[PDB]
Amino acid sequence: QLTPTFYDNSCPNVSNIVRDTIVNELRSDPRIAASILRLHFHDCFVNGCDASILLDNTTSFRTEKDAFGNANSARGFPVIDRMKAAVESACPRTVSCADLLTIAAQQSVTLAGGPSWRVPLGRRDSLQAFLDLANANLPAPFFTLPQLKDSFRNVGLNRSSDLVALSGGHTFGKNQCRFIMDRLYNFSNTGLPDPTLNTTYLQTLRGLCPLNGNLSALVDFDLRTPTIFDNKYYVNLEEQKGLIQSDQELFSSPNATDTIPLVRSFANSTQTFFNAFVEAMDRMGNITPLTGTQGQIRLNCRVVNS
Amino acid sequence: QLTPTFYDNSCPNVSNIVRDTIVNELRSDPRIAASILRLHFHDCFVNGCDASILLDNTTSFRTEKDAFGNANSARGFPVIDRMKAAVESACPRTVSCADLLTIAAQQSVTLAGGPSWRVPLGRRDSLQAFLDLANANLPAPFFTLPQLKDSFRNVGLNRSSDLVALSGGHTFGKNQCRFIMDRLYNFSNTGLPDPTLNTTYLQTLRGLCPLNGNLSALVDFDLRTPTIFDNKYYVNLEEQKGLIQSDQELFSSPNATDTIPLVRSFANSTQTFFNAFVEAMDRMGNITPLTGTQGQIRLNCRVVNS
Amino acid sequence: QLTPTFYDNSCPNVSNIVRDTIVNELRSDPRIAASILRLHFHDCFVNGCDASILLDNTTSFRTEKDAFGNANSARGFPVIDRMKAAVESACPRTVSCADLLTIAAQQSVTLAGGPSWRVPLGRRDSLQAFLDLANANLPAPFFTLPQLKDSFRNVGLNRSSDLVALSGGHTFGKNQCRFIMDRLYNFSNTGLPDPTLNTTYLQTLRGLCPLNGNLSALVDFDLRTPTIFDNKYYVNLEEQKGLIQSDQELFSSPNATDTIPLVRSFANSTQTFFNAFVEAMDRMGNITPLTGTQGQIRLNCRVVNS
Amino acid sequence: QLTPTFYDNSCPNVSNIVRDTIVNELRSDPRIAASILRLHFHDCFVNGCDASILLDNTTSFRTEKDAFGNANSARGFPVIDRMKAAVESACPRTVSCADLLTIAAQQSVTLAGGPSWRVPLGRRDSLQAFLDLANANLPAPFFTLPQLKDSFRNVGLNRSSDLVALSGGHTFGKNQCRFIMDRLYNFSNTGLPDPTLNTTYLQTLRGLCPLNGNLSALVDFDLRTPTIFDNKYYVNLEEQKGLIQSDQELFSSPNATDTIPLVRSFANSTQTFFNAFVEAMDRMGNITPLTGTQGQIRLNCRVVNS
Amino acid sequence: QLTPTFYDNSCPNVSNIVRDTIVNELRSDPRIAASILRLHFHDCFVNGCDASILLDNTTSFRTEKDAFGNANSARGFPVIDRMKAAVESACPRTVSCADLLTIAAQQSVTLAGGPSWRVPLGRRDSLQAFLDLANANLPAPFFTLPQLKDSFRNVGLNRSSDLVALSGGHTFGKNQCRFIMDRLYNFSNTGLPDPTLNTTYLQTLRGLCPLNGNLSALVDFDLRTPTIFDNKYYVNLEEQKGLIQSDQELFSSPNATDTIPLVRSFANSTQTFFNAFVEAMDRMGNITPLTGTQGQIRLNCRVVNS
Amino acid sequence: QLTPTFYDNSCPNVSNIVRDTIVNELRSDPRIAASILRLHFHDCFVNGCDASILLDNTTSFRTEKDAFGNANSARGFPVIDRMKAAVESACPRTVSCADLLTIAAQQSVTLAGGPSWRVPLGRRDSLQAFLDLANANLPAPFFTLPQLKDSFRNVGLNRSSDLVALSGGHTFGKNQCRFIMDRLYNFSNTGLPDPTLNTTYLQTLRGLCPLNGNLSALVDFDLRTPTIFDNKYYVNLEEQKGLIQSDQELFSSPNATDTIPLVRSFANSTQTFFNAFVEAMDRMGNITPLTGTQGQIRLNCRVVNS
């Protein structure tokens, strides 16, 4: 039902427009590509990729921007508005916000040096935002592996490769100190740091996130190549250098039987990882989409067309 | 206009409640899933899926339960009342009986081992029952293929796949002897059995439905897997083992030019059949629904809210 | 994702059927093998090998047959229809037109004496034709080397070997006089012939394409073996006997630094060329294919299944 | 590094001298202003504005005058020699040929009625001519929009305004029939004229360039004001009256998403166009200049000082 | 594309492991080396050396073990499983079953005293088994020479040396009486034994395979050195002592014009035969392999990885 | 005497070749761009940019690779050999190793995100390596500011901007712990750390370079953007975060009167820094070059042509 050539006759330049917008932002916000990939992920895990995450509050529904995994964390919204205005100008009423965000996530990966592919298209925009569902569906950094696995399965991403490949999104981007404190100082009430955190790195992290510092300070997800989309994320995991608990568990959990091989496999071959990432991405992009005449094609991503 | 996420913020647990109710019934009535799928079908073919079939007699209108294809045949009503009370208790005045029956039919298929999907929702309940329309719209086992085709077209299901896929509902469930007698003994006044009925099976059927037995005795629609929702129904058709005339005609009628390929196709691939079934089901679920402020959300499925 | 054994259980005889059809045509049209190889190439460069080039005009989309590089040039369509009818007869609804054209191109090469291999299979057919994209993506005979290189890169064929190997398709086949006139008489407004065209050959070409003759008259791409698929194409390039500008530039352009070695290499070893050709062909055959449930398996290559 | 006041103390009268020379030529060759603007453009696109285009053949290097876009097309050289002798007489050894040609191009625009500004100065003259680079860098009338865009980007003119503004140089000047024939009779082998050429104008052009006439006959670039530097060039584009393919594509190409607005914008306001032109011109004038002690200040523009 | 050093950095000990396993088996089953060489041959002739022959039945495909030339004949499977477990233990997920069987066949030859060489590596495992293709591609003992030649050509082994060299695999190993009965008693309905079978040997064979004995009793292929890989196989052919019809025909067929010289040549020089064998083996090992990312690296040779 | 257009007619593709080589290396060694910039610097400071640093030992002279500032520090040599072979293949005997290394250093800067410019060319290669001169001319991390200033002046880089701009090369790249130990623990026998090293950073550095760790472990020169060529290097200096003593002294030395303003100036404007860097680079590239017929054009950078 979704096809990569959906706009080829109706709006042949969409990807160019999306790409130009991102390249442009990158000059002022080098973090933009990572943020955008994350928005798509947060979009798709709550009722599919329907742009529900882009809606602002209304008297009929609460915005997903207030969900626990989005509040004071999700960012990049004005950039999406900018690309939407640009494409409305070129192909009035034709490209939905759901598709736009998908194309943008894909372009962000390629621009950060990752694989290049054409994402299936033709999704439509939701009529409401689902805050409660977002609170229930988004995974948290403190989940154990069986919990992460449960979280992915819940939305239909039932293969270990889905979880392992998609976690590679942590090959760039930033993370707040608040999310790693319980690991640097008192992990799970043991009164000691997380035993799976390499001790040399532990010292560095403590320097970046001092026990009485700013919890909103940012640290890079990938210590090797912080801004390049490549497979270094997996190399770090093998050395016990995954930044957040959910990262390290893919390699260090007693339940990581089925994941350790994929991790090793992705760490050994950039190509194997890229192919896997691309397939996992297209599976995530296919979660319960709105197609045909369901939903709408928003004029502005933040509000339902009236 | 109908969207699968309609209740996601208002009554997130509906499907769970519906599913639990059915699983529970299944312990005492293994036939319940089949019966429920049949109610939805009989609902949708008479003025759309508006729960009109669930209304009991009033002084202003006759119940569809007395229609020729419903009388002493349709069953499962108390189970619908039970799930309705359960959901009224969880989400007072929010889920209509039309939606409830749709969710229930879908859950019955999955629970019997069929595909799993999210049905479009947001239908509303009718204000009256349409007995005459039911007498005119419901197909009968003795219809020829052009008649079955006419019957489906009449309600908008105009593709051969609609008829072939939806007939796969006969992959489980029961059927009364009365409906196959004219085939086992004197078919169409020829004084002989239906030539399209495999002769070995003919003997078995005669053992189950003796010339002077109980016409209400039940036989399984699918001799291979009587209770499992799978594609065996089509395999039987190729061997001349379709139970009722309307089943066998999809493969044996001289007019079965456009249907034979679909039958063969569904018999060869469980996946092809499942996809087809799901699409056909969603097309049937979209017949002239009552949406927006039309119709109502009944407190009890058997009566109009006063 | 694409595998050479895709039809081995479902339609084991496809290649035989394709081969027999071509052998048969060859008796009446000795040019058929060359034409078919060219169709596949023109198919793959416009949204991948999805048989989009085979669709005829509809009210929703214009046919690619009217694209600048196809109009009054592309040929062989009725032969594809013939092989499609033959395979539909043997394996109803199983082999897509995209796969058929790929198998046909490969068989045409082998039958003209080239290498023999099994092409990866499992592609599906597009839902529309892309005329504008064809106008933008197909290379022209007057492109400079950096332009040819840009054209190939654009579709993902980013290696110099891709361009050099695939240009070897000019080892057989015909070309119209109109495409070489600017070279025989007034090259690039210099008022003189192309200095890279051997002068003895120049005289012959002028005899074949007189200044006031028929622009549609045909000349052979390869003067050594016009109909045999071998490496002579490269030997001609070293002697300044490439027929069209884009051919000669691979060896004579000031930017031909990376291509001259491959040309020399392919001219010295039939085996080296064959291996290269085969790999380049499989890379071209892998451009953004439609797989799984995307696109369809057409009953007739010229129209979308309704 | 380049400053508009470079000669203000050393040779305060240069512009006057340049202007007087042009005014004088204009009496005998009304086309001179257009030709001169074109020389500067052809100078700057090949290794920057270094007067490399003005050098005649030597035994060490071939003249750029033989490049494909210059041969039997570029003109105005003796007029440059005349202004050079005049300024050598006033300020011996002080003004380079690169600066002279820049001042001349600017004066030609103003004298034809365009904006007036002071161009940045201080460039120096090259030691050789670059024929191959000229063959690779100069755009041709048959390029598609993505090709024109690629051509400009290649030399550093990376904004759509650069291409759109600078194409306005076609607001005056002449063009040979040979460059529009493929459009009037057989466009891209379609056997039909270019569909983007207004049909009334098509007839006029055919009258000026008969199918068997003189290919060197000249037609005006701008049908509204052939000799006045103004924004009419853009008005013609909106009516499908751009003379050469590269002109019309800025408005009619499927890829003209980012250019159509600029075209419309320049067509609506002479001032907006003038400002844009001036900025684009100064960006082109800044391509990799030779400054300080690099290159030399030629005594005669056609030869390197020995 | 296939290289002998493929595992040298990833799993340097594979050959040692394979060799040790075979040496070990040899103590209990002296026939193991011959059987293994035969498995590789049967693997390669059905869709290339992709380990398709090692897969057991599934509901999606029938095992090739039931093919006419495999049923109650092919053996050695548990030994392959043993070496696979041993190498999985040393280099988890790195060596495919296709490569393993190739290395094993080569080691079996050397261990039986044949030449020693490094086989090209890097093949991958198939996703299905091809029973019908096996029934069509495997040669039978009763084929005439033109039929054997046709059989080899069909898979790409088009030289007479391929057939003659590879038939030398009969220099060791066993054969069932059933395959030589038609020759010892009633050859081709002549009511007489095969005239090309030396009469003294005929008597011995009759003693081993009595007219009413066990058809599964085994006789040695090579009467001179039954277990040593050497050229004696050819010496026997010259004396009319080839055991099965396809063996003797290489020397006695009226069509054996091109083969008789090779036979004589191999009978005269152990070195000439060894070189030929090795080259023929590497050509057979190169039949349509799955490389790069095609196919997979099985964890267990009998089943597809799920 | 040196001109940026030196190879434009003789080997127009050199820069492309150099750039492609580096882009390629970057995939495996992200540190390559930094290393290459450093080689050029070490080349130019010892008898000018004459590629003397690239020569290996001979019986007539010792290699500069053994100089104190090169031994177990300088790297990237095989990459230079690779680009040299590539350009010899395209323009035999035309580009010297001295020019190649200059182009490479410039390309490394741009590829890491720095300015883009065309370096003056035409240098030639030396006939010997100068080890003693290298020992005397290369600056060390422990030099005081007057010593650094003396070192630069000695080779002709007599402006404070030369030292300040060129020190910005430390905006990327790595440095060994051994070079910062005296600063982290016992600075200049004071028994205390360097007072000009920010104390928070001091802790981090100590974590990276423990008092009894590996002296060859690497730390990044720029803590803000370790791999991006930008002006952050200067921002760190103002916060006392220059990594090595010679870095911090430009801002903290009592003699830093003339340098502090430049540091502040470069920290405030990326453009000001880029312009300065480029000019400083071209001044360094002009140190006593071998031109005309002096020196030679090496076939291989490691040895003198014999």
Ligand code: HEM
């Ligand atoms: C194409 C025309 C159709 C005809 C003529 C027909 C006829 C029948 C008949 C006569 C029975 C048995 C009634 C009894 O013994 O009391 C029956 C049962 C059933 N039918 Fe159909 N049917 C048709 C289409 C469908 C469709 C489209 C569906 C649903 C998707 C369906 C689902 C069922 C099920 C599941 C049962 C068994 C119900 C139970 O056991 O309670 N039928 N049908």
Ligand code: HEM
């Ligand atoms: C590299 C750029 C290429 C250009 C500019 C180009 C151009 C052309 C032209 C102009 C013709 C003759 C058209 C006519 O007279 O009607 C032609 C014919 C042909 N081309 Fe190419 N071609 C290119 C690449 C390829 C590729 C990659 C293949 C296939 C692997 C190919 C295969 C053929 C064949 C076999 C013919 C003859 C077709 C026939 O006789 O019907 N070409 N090509």
Ligand code: HEM
């Ligand atoms: C965008 C791509 C461009 C193309 C493909 C192009 C093409 C041409 C052609 C083919 C001619 C006529 C040649 C002849 O008949 O001999 C011409 C003339 C001219 N072009 Fe362009 N041009 C381009 C850009 C420019 C630019 C940027 C300028 C200057 C700012 C310019 C200024 C002129 C002028 C003034 C003439 C007339 C010269 C005369 O009458 O002597 N062109 N151009």
Ligand code: HEM
């Ligand atoms: C002002 C005096 C300078 C001193 C004392 C100095 C010192 C050093 C030292 C000690 C290292 C690390 C060596 C190692 O760990 O093996 C280094 C690396 C580096 N230096 Fe400098 N340097 C100076 C000037 C420059 C200049 C002018 C440039 C170039 C424009 C430069 C570019 C680099 C680069 C890019 C690296 C990292 C190389 C790599 O990662 O391989 N340095 N420098």
Ligand SMILES: [Ca+2]
């Ligand atoms: Ca969503």
Ligand SMILES: [Ca+2]
């Ligand atoms: Ca990374």
Ligand SMILES: [Ca+2]
């Ligand atoms: Ca109803």
Ligand SMILES: [Ca+2]
């Ligand atoms: Ca069943």
Ligand SMILES: [Ca+2]
């Ligand atoms: Ca296509």
Ligand SMILES: [Ca+2]
């Ligand atoms: Ca040929």
Ligand SMILES: [Ca+2]
């Ligand atoms: Ca120039």
Ligand SMILES: [Ca+2]
């Ligand atoms: Ca004008």
Ligand SMILES: [Ca+2]
């Ligand atoms: Ca096989």
Ligand SMILES: [Ca+2]
């Ligand atoms: Ca033997």
Ligand SMILES: [Ca+2]
């Ligand atoms: Ca030096």
Ligand SMILES: [Ca+2]
């Ligand atoms: Ca930096």
